[PDB]
Design a protein around this ligand. Structure first.
Ligand SMILES: Nc1nc2c([nH]c(=O)n2[C@H]2C[C@H](O)[C@@H](CO)O2)c(=O)[nH]1
Length: 242
């Protein structure tokens, strides 16, 4: 329950969350691949846009992020809106609600155009400001699952581009997708936002890093590449959440 999961999340720590992000999560592997075949500014813009349309997918989120990375590798992208207008109808894994998704990309296009490499650096040092900027450009509540998720994925892309790590702000709540919501119901009747913020504050692990611990495992990622000390902690968590 809450007490035991906060203890184990605390023992895993931001250190353990970062290991999972940078070594286990296939989505980071996909981003690393894309980073080697498109310029850094476009890479970061594309990752934010892709996050904001990563919902009502088909198949598995990890397959979608690999499709995105393999598609944009080596492409000459100008308008991100026009790139998604050509990409999404030809997608295997993102075929529903395409006009809705495209209108979201149209709305954030001006904001994305401000992401020079200098500005990307500044935002990685102040991800709370990025969080509000994305929400305001979209015209939505910042608590929205895809908005907080886009901040997480910005942090994946930015650490690759900038060769530095900054932790996600404690105040950014967990992205409430089907994996997180279904797990939360097994554990509690509390709404996931309050539940995981309490665990975050008790453990010292910000909610977006808690997401990195939980979400790959809930999709079936293997923990067997983790070093023994970490792997033993991940196994205790799996027995809790499974
Ligand atoms: N919580 C969460 N959601 C994800 C991840 N990857 C991904 O594609 N999603 C989708 C699910 C959902 O539609 C959106 C917000 O959670 O992001 C991910 O890593 N974590």
């Amino acid at each position: 329950g809450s007490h035991m999961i906060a203890r184990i999340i605390g023992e895993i720590g931001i250190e353990g969350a970062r290991f999972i992000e940078e070594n286990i999560d296939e989505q980071f592997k996909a981003l690393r691949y894309l980073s080697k075949g498109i310029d850094s500014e476009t890479f970061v813009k594309l990752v934010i846009a892709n996050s904001l349309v990563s919902y009502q997918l088909t198949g598995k989120g990890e397959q979608w992020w690999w499709e995105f990375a393999k598609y944009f590798y080596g492409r000459d992208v100008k308008s991100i809106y026009l790139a998604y207008k050509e990409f999404l109808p030809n997608s295997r894994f993102n075929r529903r609600l395409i006009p809705q998704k495209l209108s979201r990309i149209r709305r954030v296009e001006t904001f994305l155009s401000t992401l020079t490499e200098e500005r990307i650096e500044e935002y990685y040092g102040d991800m709370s400001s990025l969080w509000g900027s994305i929400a305001r450009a979209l015209g939505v509540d910042k608590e929205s699952k895809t908005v907080v998720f886009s901040v997480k994925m910005f942090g994946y892309a930015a650490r690759i581009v900038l060769s530095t790590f900054n932790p996600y702000p404690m105040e950014i709540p967990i992205p409430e997708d089907s994996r997180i919501v279904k797990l939360t119901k097994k554990l509690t009747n509390e709404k996931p936002r309050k539940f995981w913020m309490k665990i975050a504050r008790e453990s010292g692990v910000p909610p977006l890093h808690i997401d990195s611990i939980l979400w790959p495992l809930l999709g079936g990622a293997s923990i067997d590449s983790a070093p023994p000390e970490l792997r033993d902690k991940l196994a205790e968590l799996i027995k809790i959440i499974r």
